[PDB]
Write a protein that binds this ligand. Sequence first.
Ligand SMILES: CCOC(=O)C1=C(C)N(c2cccc(C(F)(F)F)c2)c2[nH]cc[n+]2[C@@H]1c1ccc(C#N)cc1
Ligand SMILES: *[C@@H]1O[C@H](CO[C@@H]2O[C@@H](C)[C@@H](O)[C@@H](O)[C@@H]2O)[C@@H](O)[C@H](O)[C@H]1NC(C)=O
Ligand SMILES: *[C@@H]1O[C@H](CO[C@@H]2O[C@@H](C)[C@@H](O)[C@@H](O)[C@@H]2O)[C@@H](O)[C@H](O)[C@H]1NC(C)=O
Length: 215
Amino acid sequence: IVGGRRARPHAWPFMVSLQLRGGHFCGATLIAPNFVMSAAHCVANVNVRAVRVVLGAHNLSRREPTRQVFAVQRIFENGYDPVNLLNDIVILQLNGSATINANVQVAQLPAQGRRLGNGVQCLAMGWGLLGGIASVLQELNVTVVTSLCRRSNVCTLVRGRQAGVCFGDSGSPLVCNGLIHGIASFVRGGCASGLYPDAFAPVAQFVNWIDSIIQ
Ligand SMILES: CCOC(=O)C1=C(C)N(c2cccc(C(F)(F)F)c2)c2[nH]cc[n+]2[C@@H]1c1ccc(C#N)cc1
Ligand SMILES: *[C@@H]1O[C@H](CO[C@@H]2O[C@@H](C)[C@@H](O)[C@@H](O)[C@@H]2O)[C@@H](O)[C@H](O)[C@H]1NC(C)=O
Ligand SMILES: *[C@@H]1O[C@H](CO[C@@H]2O[C@@H](C)[C@@H](O)[C@@H](O)[C@@H]2O)[C@@H](O)[C@H](O)[C@H]1NC(C)=O
């Protein structure tokens, strides 16, 4: 996250860190005790048997007792199309069930087909590049836009300054009106261009599919 701020510890207990040999590479969202959802591009060309799923984290540079660590049991995809940058969603079924507590909670999703108007205020977040990489979870105020976007993405922009998601924020939630409306998918013009809106997978379009998998 470029131009964001540190989150209050555990303010976002659905927020997940996807890791290889101890290092963050992508975000995810806890959507049920034994399921997270991320961006399909996070896991493409990655051996998932190597991925550690980290719930309850805040400072990735610190040893944290609040954490719960899982392996990926199974993955579900929905027509990931990297050429067109479409359907950038993946569900990762965990090798066990999260212990739901103060620091580890399941996110709330919108209803199928639910659309966001131009000018809705959302929050982006993640452990990605700061402009080094983040130790503490960062958050950022962003605004939903349609100029330079498509119907098959939720796009957001910070106005009046250069701020936005960046490398390592991929897969992370976008929270709008208390609901997970986006999964961080792609940037144009590099990170925090001040010209091109950030693009997220439109979680509302995939709600029926998500529910059929989790329940
Ligand atoms: C195959 C792996 O590619 C990447 O890792 C990409 C990354 C990180 N970002 C990327 C970079 C910075 C921040 C983010 C974001 F928005 F997810 F936080 C994504 C990116 N930007 C533009 C193209 N890409 C590609 C990309 C390719 C296909 C799709 C789809 N569908 C989405 C992104
Ligand atoms: C689920 O897996 C947890 C951690 O698994 C670890 O990470 C993966 C990616 C591999 O490196 C694996 O060898 C590691 O053990 C366990 O701590 C936990 O006990 C598992 N839950 C089960 C099977 O009940
Ligand atoms: C910056 O963001 C703050 C929090 O945003 C609100 O809560 C999050 C979790 C989402 O549900 C989002 O839709 C909400 O707007 C706001 O309280 C604050 O007013 C924002 N400031 C501005 C001017 O953007």
